[PDB]
């Protein structure tokens, strides 16, 4: 395996869309767990390469699991940098992904085609596989997965869209919380069930504070 | 090989949390064209018959792709009558899930275990597919995906968890039509592209109206 994942991360301020629910130390630390989740799930399915993208050293000063990488420019600017001077394919994969396993990881990154998409909640793209750095441009925020499938194509590129629910749950407000209580293990669901608990109320279920 | 399919399905008030985004008319409509694409899809995975289990007539006067069924009971009961009148597998489809291909339906009823699993959002049941009706009971509503487990290995019986993100988008909310625009083709889709647009505004896509 020649192949990179580098993680898009900033701990500082980390998930605002949380903070009905979540303090900011709480919000941090979530984030925090989340991360060390996902680059042990990169490692567990065999990608030793591991690059974490910040704009900020805060929170990454121990960090030795991934080399920590800093850059102050926006996302779409920094991704594109780091593409650029990628010489072996890049998995794109977002931090806050709690329900992503190994196995998911490798079968995204074992697509046939030149690019694998992951869509998030929203429309936004949650993973990206993608085999040619050099030939492909990214452009995250807003409608994202279906402007990373016209990129891919405008570009003479083919594309897979990996069908994933568990990677398919970016975790960014406080109902996606109920989305982890239910389906994830690990110290970020654990974390996250020493201080809410799930409560049937409309025939629905809904979050509510321990 | 053998199997029957269920939908549980009211056209009437059918869609509540919709509202008011869309109108009691539009609900309507709404919700039956959602309907005959999941029949769609169960006929193009080439099962035999589909049942429509449904409290009424209503929205069902003319219906020839698949059996009615009526039964005024709550819906855990009128399902679960039908699980002790078949002696076969039973596939129980929501006619929610308007990203539901033959292919998903295909491989549900395929699984290796004994019951297959689809999750929908907030801990719901998109779909379940149960190869022995005679041991299994179902409890909608609520919690409904952790409980279908429980049922499942309380009774002796292993399951499968289908991990798909098409087949876990059942369309309840507004934001759900969101996913509908992005991921979704055919009518029920048009239906809702003839009505809204996306828009990006905090970076993110929201739905407005046309």
Request: with cysteine; proline share 5%; glycine share 8%.
């Amino acid at each position: 395996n020649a192949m990179r994942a580098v993680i898009p991360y900033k701990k500082a301020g980390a998930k605002s869309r949380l903070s009905p629910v979540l303090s900011l130390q709480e919000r941090e630390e979530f984030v925090e767990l989340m991360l060390n989740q996902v680059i042990s799930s990169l490692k567990g399915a065999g990608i030793e390469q591991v690059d974490i993208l910040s704009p900020s050293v805060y929170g990454l000063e121990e960090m030795t699991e991934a080399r920590v990488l800093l850059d102050e420019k926006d996302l779409n600017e920094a991704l594109n940098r780091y593409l650029k001077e990628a010489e072996e394919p890049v998995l794109i994969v977002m931090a806050d992904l709690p329900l992503l396993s190994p196995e998911h990881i490798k079968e995204i990154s074992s697509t046939e085609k030149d690019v694998c998409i992951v869509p998030g909640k929203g429309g936004g793209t949650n993973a990206l596989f993608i085999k040619n750095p050099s030939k492909y441009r990214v452009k995250y925020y807003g409608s994202s997965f279906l402007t990373h499938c016209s990129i891919a194509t405008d570009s003479g590129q083919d594309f897979e869209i990996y069908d994933s629910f568990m990677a398919g749950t970016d975790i960014d407000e406080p109902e996606d919380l109920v989305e982890l209580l239910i389906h994830g293990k690990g110290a970020a669901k654990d974390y996250i069930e020493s201080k809410f608990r799930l409560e049937v109320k409309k025939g629905r279920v809904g979050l509510v504070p321990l």
